[PDB]
């Protein structure tokens, strides 16, 4: 290296803009953004690869520069502008508007929502600031800072942000008993109420999580971003609802739906 | 005596010391209000840190260093440097072929704050990963326990 690297080989490309070995050498590379390269969806992959809306890269070029696509209600012309946990992506000439919730396997859904539910949005918080003259600042996981928050918002909690305004509207501290989707690692896009977290000094903290069916995974704190007060997620969930079925079960349940389904 | 020995004046910054136009002798009874800190991870900031007349920038019990990463232990083997000792960490590196281990060691120079008195060789000592403090020395002694073996 000398400078920064403006390029990405297919293969090296993470496991979920779900790309295939043939067809190319390169993968698209998230242009820098709010979300970290490794936890993205460059718009381009929706269009040609997920929805089969376009076909190629040029087909997508011609889409976004009509100015149809609106990633959190603010219009993007970058084919490679990164989306990631908790975004919107309104199409508008269609009225579909999706999210970007990850599936139980951790691979970003094609999950459609109402025209409502494209206003409320969620965001975890990374720090309290106290900026200057005592004006306090948030830092959302999607790299918004939001000045002037309610002083009871602490770190790792979530915010029910509007969109057209920015702003905040009511919120969920990170206690026991509330609802968590997991945004990192293995137990990824898997959902459940907490139970108990294990504070450690130095090394970052572990969080035990129980789900509907009663399967306790644990995680590091920095992957848990919460989604409700307790067994009441404010957002619509993906079909499956981050329960996660053992390959054994999934296999049979998929196959058991088959034959009986007609 | 003792403290200001070297050439430049040695002082805890973030205590300005003078202001006095009142009775009760001259200065306070502590005289110099001493900057110390609690370090963290529960290790008791020892008595001689707080009591002490002394001064070393590289001590965490009386100066600017942050302890922040990997906590280890070793044994004290040589104390022939000034405000630094050498510790010796022993182990078993495993070969898989030969389904057995061999003894190894990586001795490691390490800061030793002179709050932390009555250390000797053959002395179990716990260390924190610090700022890269000198050429070799990245570690700073946090709690000497003198424990295994011999006597009070």
């Amino acid at each position: 290296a000398r400078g920064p690297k403006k390029h990405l080989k297919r293969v090296a490309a993470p496991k979920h803009w779900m790309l295939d070995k043939l067809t190319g050498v390169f993968a698209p590379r998230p242009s820098t953004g709010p979300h970290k390269l490794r936890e993205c969806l460059p718009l381009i992959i929706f269009l040609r690869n997920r929805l089969k809306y376009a076909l190629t890269g040029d087909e997508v070029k011609k889409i976004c520069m009509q100015r149809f696509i609106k990633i959190d209600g603010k219009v993007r012309t970058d084919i490679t502008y990164p989306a990631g946990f908790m975004d919107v992506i309104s199409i508008d000439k269609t009225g579909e508007n999706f999210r970007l919730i990850y599936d139980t396997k951790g691979r970003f859904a094609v999950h459609r929502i109402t025209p409502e539910e494209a206003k409320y949005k969620l965001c975890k918080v990374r720090k309290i600031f106290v900026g200057t003259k005592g004006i306090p600042h948030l830092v959302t996981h999607d790299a918004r800072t939001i000045r002037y928050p309610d002083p009871l918002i602490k770190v790792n909690d979530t915010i029910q942000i509007d969109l057209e305004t920015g702003k905040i509207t009511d919120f969920i501290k990170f206690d026991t008993g509330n609802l968590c989707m997991v945004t990192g690692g293995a137990n990824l896009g898997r959902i459940g109420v907490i139970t108990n977290r294990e504070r450690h000094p130095g090394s970052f903290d572990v969080v035990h999580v129980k789900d509907a069916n009663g399967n306790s995974f644990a995680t590091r704190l920095s992957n848990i971003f919460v989604i409700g007060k307790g067994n009441k997620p404010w957002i619509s969930l993906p079909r499956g609802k981050g329960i996660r079925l053992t390959i054994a079960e999934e296999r049979d349940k998929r196959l058991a739906a088959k034959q009986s389904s007609g | 005596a003792d403290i200001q020995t070297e050439r430049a004046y040695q002082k805890q910054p973030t205590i300005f010391q003078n202001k006095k136009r009142v009775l009760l002798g001259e200065t306070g009874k502590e005289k110099l209000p001493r900057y110390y800190k609690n370090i963290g991870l529960g290790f008791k900031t020892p008595k001689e840190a707080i009591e002490g007349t002394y001064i070393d920038k590289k001590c965490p019990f009386t100066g600017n260093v942050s302890i922040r990463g990997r906590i280890l232990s070793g044994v004290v083997t040589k104390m022939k440097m000034q405000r630094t000792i050498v510790i010796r960490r022993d182990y078993l590196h495993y070969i898989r072929k030969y389904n057995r281990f061999e003894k190894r060691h990586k001795n490691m120079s390490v800061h030793l704050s002179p709050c932390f008195r009555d250390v000797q060789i053959g002395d179990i000592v716990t260390v924190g990963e610090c700022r890269p403090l000198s050429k070799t020395v990245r570690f700073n002694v946090l709690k000497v326990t003198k424990a295994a073996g011999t006597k009070k």
Binding site: - | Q4, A8, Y9, Q17, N18, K19, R21, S109, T136
Partner: protein, 206 residues
């Protein structure tokens, strides 16, 4: 150029590291400022980041303070005294962080002589009688007399300072980096500080 790298020198044990790369723009060393005392002369430098760095090569004045009284007039730096590092930097009059320097007393004199209204050094009655009482002699009184009689006893100075003001030069020590910063900022050597450095100077000259 004149690099700053662990890359070249021996390892702890005493083996000789081989090279690895070339020198990179990285382990970069510029030559020194070794700043003097003259009419101001500072060159900028462009550095890493973009950013810049104010390397002083001639430097006359400093923005540098009482501890106790809690002021800091901007004052001429008259002359370097000892510098603990090394004894060329004294002779050559090279200002660097923790140089001990003589400075002008005058701007510090002239706000006791506002504030508490009591003189320094000692004099017969040449400057004092026309100007101090020109600072004193009240026609407001009552509020003010109460005020810098509330500025009480403790319009007081240590003998050690009191002395120096006869001379119109104070002992102070640089706390900025003239070569990095661009200024020769500092505190006045006051109380304990002030007592080696005299005793160093005294013992040095013999």
């Amino acid at each position: 150029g004149i690099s700053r790298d662990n890359w070249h020198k021996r390892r702890k044990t005493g083996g000789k590291r081989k090279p690895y790369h070339k020198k990179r723009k990285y382990e970069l060393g510029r030559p020194a400022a070794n700043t003097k005392i003259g009419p101001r002369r500072i060159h900028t430098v462009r550095v890493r980041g973009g950013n810049k760095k104010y390397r002083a090569l001639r430097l006359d004045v400093g923005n540098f303070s009482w501890g106790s009284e809690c002021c800091t007039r901007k004052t001429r730096i008259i002359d370097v005294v000892y510098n603990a590092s090394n004894n060329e930097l004294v002779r050559t009059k090279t200002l660097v962080k923790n140089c001990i320097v003589l400075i002008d007393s005058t701007p510090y004199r002239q706000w006791y002589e506002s504030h508490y209204a009591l003189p320094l050094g000692r004099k017969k009655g040449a400057k004092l009688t026309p100007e101090e009482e020109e600072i004193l002699n009240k026609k407001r009184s009552k509020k003010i007399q109460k005020k810098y009689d509330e500025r009480k006893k403790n319009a007081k100075i240590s003998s050690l300072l009191e002395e120096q003001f006869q001379q119109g030069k104070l002992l102070a020590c640089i706390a900025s980096r003239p070569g990095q910063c661009g200024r020769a900022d500092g505190y006045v050597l006051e109380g304990k500080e002030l007592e080696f450095y005299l005793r160093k100077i005294k013992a040095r000259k013999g």
